[PDB]
Amino acid sequence: GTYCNTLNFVRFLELGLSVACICTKFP
Amino acid sequence: MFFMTRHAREPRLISAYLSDMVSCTQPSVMVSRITHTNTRGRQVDGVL
């Protein structure tokens, strides 16, 4: 009936700060 | 020391104090199935 939320993760490109820079992947 | 007595005239400093007070404690981490609600559907956060 009552639980505990653990590990509130977060991504980067959903943050909002990802409009001042153009991030890109490279192997 | 005394909000409601000294600043009894300005009604905005009191509201600022209340906002600072409610936004001062770390929210507890407990998800539950059946909790308190309002008519529309918003859940209650704290007690004063």
Coordinates of N, CA, C and O in Angstrom, one line a residue:
Chain A
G1 N 0.8 -1.2 0.0 CA 0.0 0.0 0.0 C 0.8 1.3 0.0 O 0.4 2.3 -0.4
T2 N 2.1 1.2 0.5 CA 3.0 2.3 0.6 C 4.4 1.8 0.2 O 4.9 0.9 0.9
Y3 N 5.0 2.5 -0.8 CA 6.3 2.1 -1.3 C 7.2 3.3 -1.2 O 6.8 4.4 -0.9
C4 N 8.5 3.0 -1.5 CA 9.5 4.1 -1.5 C 10.1 4.2 -2.9 O 10.6 3.1 -3.5
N5 N 10.2 5.4 -3.4 CA 10.8 5.6 -4.8 C 12.3 5.8 -4.6 O 12.8 6.6 -3.8
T6 N 13.1 5.0 -5.3 CA 14.5 5.0 -5.3 C 15.1 5.3 -6.7 O 14.4 5.0 -7.7
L7 N 16.2 5.9 -6.7 CA 17.0 6.2 -8.0 C 16.1 7.0 -8.9 O 15.7 6.5 -10.0
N8 N 15.9 8.3 -8.5 CA 15.3 9.2 -9.4 C 16.4 9.6 -10.5 O 17.2 10.5 -10.3
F9 N 16.3 8.9 -11.6 CA 17.3 9.1 -12.7 C 17.0 10.4 -13.4 O 16.0 11.1 -13.2
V10 N 17.9 10.8 -14.3 CA 17.7 12.0 -15.1 C 18.5 11.9 -16.4 O 19.7 11.3 -16.4
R11 N 18.0 12.3 -17.5 CA 18.7 12.3 -18.8 C 19.2 13.8 -19.0 O 19.0 14.7 -18.2
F12 N 19.8 14.0 -20.2 CA 20.4 15.2 -20.5 C 19.7 16.0 -21.6 O 19.4 17.2 -21.4
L13 N 19.4 15.3 -22.7 CA 18.7 16.0 -23.8 C 17.3 16.3 -23.5 O 16.6 17.1 -24.3
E14 N 16.7 15.9 -22.4 CA 15.4 16.3 -22.0 C 15.4 17.4 -21.0 O 14.4 18.0 -20.6
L15 N 16.6 17.7 -20.5 CA 16.8 18.7 -19.4 C 16.3 20.1 -19.9 O 15.4 20.7 -19.4
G16 N 16.9 20.6 -21.0 CA 16.6 22.0 -21.5 C 17.9 22.7 -21.7 O 18.0 23.5 -22.7
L17 N 18.9 22.4 -20.9 CA 20.2 23.0 -21.2 C 20.8 22.5 -22.5 O 21.8 23.1 -23.0
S18 N 20.2 21.5 -23.2 CA 20.7 21.0 -24.4 C 20.1 21.8 -25.6 O 19.6 21.2 -26.6
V19 N 20.2 23.1 -25.5 CA 19.9 24.0 -26.7 C 21.0 25.1 -26.8 O 20.9 25.8 -27.8
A20 N 21.9 25.1 -25.9 CA 23.1 26.0 -26.1 C 24.2 25.2 -26.8 O 25.2 25.9 -27.3
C21 N 24.2 23.9 -26.9 CA 25.3 23.1 -27.5 C 24.7 22.1 -28.4 O 23.6 21.6 -28.1
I22 N 25.4 21.7 -29.4 CA 25.0 20.6 -30.3 C 25.9 19.4 -29.9 O 27.0 19.2 -30.4
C23 N 25.3 18.5 -29.1 CA 25.9 17.3 -28.7 C 25.9 16.2 -29.8 O 24.9 16.2 -30.6
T24 N 26.9 15.4 -29.9 CA 26.9 14.4 -30.9 C 27.8 13.3 -30.5 O 28.8 13.5 -29.8
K25 N 27.5 12.1 -30.9 CA 28.2 10.8 -30.6 C 29.3 10.6 -31.6 O 29.2 10.9 -32.8
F26 N 30.4 9.9 -31.1 CA 31.5 9.5 -32.0 C 32.2 8.3 -31.3 O 32.5 8.4 -30.1
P27 N 32.4 7.2 -32.0 CA 33.0 6.1 -31.3 C 34.5 6.2 -31.0 O 34.9 5.9 -29.8
Chain B
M1 N 11.8 37.4 14.6 CA 11.2 36.8 15.8 C 9.7 36.7 15.7 O 9.2 35.6 15.8
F2 N 9.0 37.8 15.4 CA 7.6 37.8 15.4 C 7.1 38.3 14.0 O 7.2 39.5 13.8
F3 N 6.7 37.4 13.2 CA 6.1 37.9 11.9 C 4.8 38.6 12.0 O 4.6 39.7 11.7
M4 N 3.8 37.8 12.6 CA 2.4 38.3 12.6 C 2.2 39.5 13.4 O 1.2 40.2 13.3
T5 N 3.2 39.8 14.3 CA 3.0 41.0 15.2 C 3.7 42.2 14.6 O 3.1 43.3 14.5
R6 N 5.0 42.1 14.2 CA 5.8 43.2 13.7 C 5.2 43.6 12.3 O 4.7 44.7 12.1
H7 N 5.3 42.7 11.4 CA 4.8 42.9 10.0 C 3.3 42.5 9.9 O 2.9 41.8 9.0
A8 N 2.5 43.1 10.8 CA 1.1 42.8 10.8 C 0.3 43.6 9.8 O -0.8 43.4 9.5
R9 N 1.0 44.6 9.1 CA 0.4 45.4 8.2 C 0.6 44.9 6.8 O -0.4 44.7 6.0
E10 N 1.8 44.7 6.4 CA 2.1 44.3 5.0 C 1.7 42.8 4.9 O 2.2 41.9 5.6
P11 N 0.7 42.5 4.0 CA 0.3 41.1 3.8 C 1.1 40.3 2.8 O 0.7 39.2 2.6
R12 N 2.2 40.9 2.3 CA 3.0 40.1 1.3 C 4.2 39.5 2.0 O 4.6 38.4 1.6
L13 N 4.8 40.2 2.9 CA 6.0 39.6 3.6 C 5.5 38.3 4.4 O 6.3 37.4 4.4
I14 N 4.3 38.3 4.9 CA 3.8 37.1 5.6 C 3.7 36.0 4.6 O 4.1 34.8 4.9
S15 N 3.2 36.2 3.4 CA 3.1 35.2 2.4 C 4.4 34.7 1.9 O 4.6 33.5 1.7
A16 N 5.4 35.6 1.8 CA 6.8 35.2 1.5 C 7.3 34.3 2.6 O 8.0 33.3 2.3
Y17 N 7.1 34.6 3.8 CA 7.5 33.8 4.9 C 6.9 32.4 4.8 O 7.6 31.4 5.0
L18 N 5.6 32.3 4.6 CA 4.9 31.0 4.5 C 5.4 30.2 3.3 O 5.6 29.0 3.4
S19 N 5.7 30.8 2.2 CA 6.2 30.1 1.0 C 7.6 29.6 1.3 O 7.9 28.4 1.0
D20 N 8.5 30.4 2.0 CA 9.8 30.0 2.4 C 9.7 28.8 3.3 O 10.5 27.9 3.3
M21 N 8.7 28.9 4.3 CA 8.6 27.8 5.3 C 8.2 26.5 4.6 O 8.7 25.4 4.9
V22 N 7.2 26.5 3.7 CA 6.7 25.3 3.1 C 7.8 24.7 2.1 O 7.9 23.5 2.0
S23 N 8.6 25.6 1.5 CA 9.6 25.2 0.6 C 11.0 25.2 1.3 O 12.0 25.7 0.9
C24 N 11.0 24.5 2.5 CA 12.2 24.4 3.3 C 12.6 23.0 3.7 O 13.7 22.7 3.9
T25 N 11.5 22.2 3.8 CA 11.7 20.8 4.2 C 11.9 19.9 3.0 O 11.2 20.1 2.0
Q26 N 12.7 18.8 3.2 CA 12.9 17.9 2.1 C 11.6 17.0 2.0 O 11.2 16.4 3.0
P27 N 11.1 16.9 0.8 CA 9.9 16.0 0.6 C 10.2 14.6 0.9 O 11.1 14.0 0.4
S28 N 9.3 14.0 1.7 CA 9.5 12.6 2.1 C 9.3 11.7 0.8 O 8.6 12.1 -0.1
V29 N 9.9 10.5 0.9 CA 9.9 9.6 -0.3 C 9.0 8.4 0.1 O 9.4 7.4 0.6
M30 N 7.7 8.5 -0.3 CA 6.7 7.5 0.0 C 5.6 7.6 -1.0 O 4.8 8.6 -1.0
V31 N 5.6 6.7 -1.9 CA 4.4 6.5 -2.8 C 3.4 5.6 -2.2 O 3.8 4.5 -1.7
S32 N 2.2 5.9 -2.2 CA 1.1 5.1 -1.7 C 0.0 5.0 -2.6 O -0.2 5.7 -3.6
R33 N -0.9 4.0 -2.3 CA -2.0 3.7 -3.2 C -3.2 4.6 -3.0 O -3.7 5.3 -4.0
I34 N -3.7 4.8 -1.8 CA -4.8 5.6 -1.4 C -4.3 6.7 -0.5 O -3.9 6.4 0.6
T35 N -4.4 7.9 -1.0 CA -4.0 9.1 -0.2 C -5.1 10.1 -0.2 O -6.2 9.9 -0.7
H36 N -4.8 11.3 0.3 CA -5.7 12.4 0.3 C -5.8 13.0 -1.0 O -4.8 13.1 -1.7
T37 N -7.0 13.5 -1.4 CA -7.2 14.2 -2.6 C -8.1 15.4 -2.4 O -8.6 15.6 -1.3
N38 N -8.2 16.3 -3.4 CA -9.2 17.3 -3.4 C -10.3 17.0 -4.4 O -10.4 15.9 -4.9
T39 N -11.2 17.9 -4.6 CA -12.4 17.7 -5.4 C -11.9 17.5 -6.9 O -12.3 16.5 -7.5
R40 N -11.0 18.3 -7.4 CA -10.5 18.2 -8.7 C -9.6 16.9 -8.9 O -9.8 16.2 -9.9
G41 N -8.7 16.7 -8.0 CA -7.9 15.5 -8.1 C -6.4 15.8 -7.6 O -5.7 14.8 -7.5
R42 N -6.1 17.0 -7.3 CA -4.8 17.3 -6.7 C -4.7 16.7 -5.3 O -5.7 16.7 -4.5
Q43 N -3.5 16.2 -5.0 CA -3.2 15.6 -3.7 C -2.7 16.7 -2.8 O -2.0 17.6 -3.2
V44 N -3.0 16.5 -1.5 CA -2.5 17.5 -0.5 C -1.1 17.1 -0.2 O -0.6 16.0 -0.2
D45 N -0.3 18.2 0.1 CA 1.2 18.0 0.3 C 1.5 18.0 1.8 O 2.1 17.1 2.4
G46 N 1.1 19.1 2.5 CA 1.4 19.3 3.9 C 0.3 19.7 4.8 O -0.8 19.9 4.4
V47 N 0.6 19.8 6.1 CA -0.4 20.3 7.1 C 0.2 21.5 7.8 O 1.4 21.6 8.1
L48 N -0.7 22.5 8.0 CA -0.3 23.7 8.7 C -1.2 23.9 9.9 O -2.4 24.2 9.7

